């Protein structure tokens, strides 16, 4: 966590709803968006830290 | 001169333009604009805000 | 019936997904309760259930 | 039996509740009074208190 990565998205189409099929976490936790709602959007740039 | 007769005009116009202004503000919710509200968020949270 | 737990956020009025756009829908005027729980013991098998 | 709990089964039980208009049929375990007239009391029928 001191020395967490973080990972550029820039330039590709995201399709949200196969993140669910990558971990096996229960439910997003999303500030200002719906989950639901990701695959309507359109950003300048996506960060993923880990 | 007709200073009284402007004062009425400039009044409403300057109640005009401070009800359209207010349509900026958030008001605690995300966003002053419904479409972004409702392009951003699911039914129930769009509800609120 | 039977879902994963990362759909059981599905089953609740004004969702969307698989689950809830092509199985099980839920109205948005909902009056009612959801009861989930883990079945891993009952439903799941070594080669897959 | 070794998937995370995202990708492990629940089994899912939804409860919908048809309240007022027609007469009642399903109810919780209350005990009925009698109907006391012409005075002020506190009433519940069929949950409408």
Redesign the interface.
């Known amino acids: 966590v001191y020395a967490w990565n973080r990972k550029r998205i820039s330039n590709c189409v995201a399709d949200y709803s196969v993140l669910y099929n990558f971990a096996p976490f229960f439910a997003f936790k999303c500030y200002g968006v719906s989950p639901t709602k990701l695959n309507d959007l359109c950003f300048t740039n996506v960060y993923a830290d880990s | 001169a007709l200073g009284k007769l402007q004062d009425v005009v400039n009044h409403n116009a300057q109640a005009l333009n401070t009800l359209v202004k207010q349509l900026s503000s958030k008001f605690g919710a ?1 966003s002053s604009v419904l479409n972004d509200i409702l ?7 769009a509800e609120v805000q | 019936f039977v879902i994963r737990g990362n759909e059981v956020s599905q089953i609740a009025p004004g969702q969307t997904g698989n689950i809830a756009d092509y199985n099980y829908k839920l109205p948005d005027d909902f009056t009612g309760c959801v009861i989930a729980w883990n079945s891993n013991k009952l439903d799941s098998k070594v080669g897959g259930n | 039996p070794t998937y995370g709990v995202g990708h492990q089964p629940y089994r899912v039980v939804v409860l919908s509740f048809e309240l007022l208009h027609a007469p009642a049929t399903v109810c919780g375990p209350k005990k009925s009074t009698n109907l006391v007239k012409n005075k002020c009391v506190n009433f519940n029928f069929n949950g409408l208190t």
């Open positions: 995300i392009s951003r968020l699911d039914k129930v949270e």
